[PDB]
């Protein structure tokens, strides 16, 4: 599904601090900044380069 | 490093219309005084710890004691009367 079954995605440290807690449409907005399109349905990319 | 043509030479530059001489001169831009605003906090609730970590875990020990050592009823050997 294209984001309609996920509340949010995050990268928290030690049950301590969310660093990129985003809903699935803002999470994909950081992907379009990177690969200039969207990955297919259900695929979620996280860049830490 | 051009070569002078002796058959068709030319002279130096003649005056041409100009670009209104004050409009090529800029103003010197006038800085006012500034301030890094606000009263800064002394510390920050950081999302990561600032100390070292350990790559591997090492097994630790603590000493224990055994107990009160008792006597025993041994099975005792036979007498060496030249059979042994």
TrEMBL record, chain A:
Subcellular location: Virion
Record protein name field: Major capsid protein
Organism: Enterobacteria phage PR772
Encoding gene, per UniProt annotation: III
Boundaries of the shown chain within the full protein: 298 to 346 of 395
From TrEMBL, chain B:
A cellular-component GO term for this protein: viral capsid
Superkingdom classification of source: Viruses
InterPro entries assigned: Tecti-min-caps (IPR015379)
Protein name: Minor capsid protein
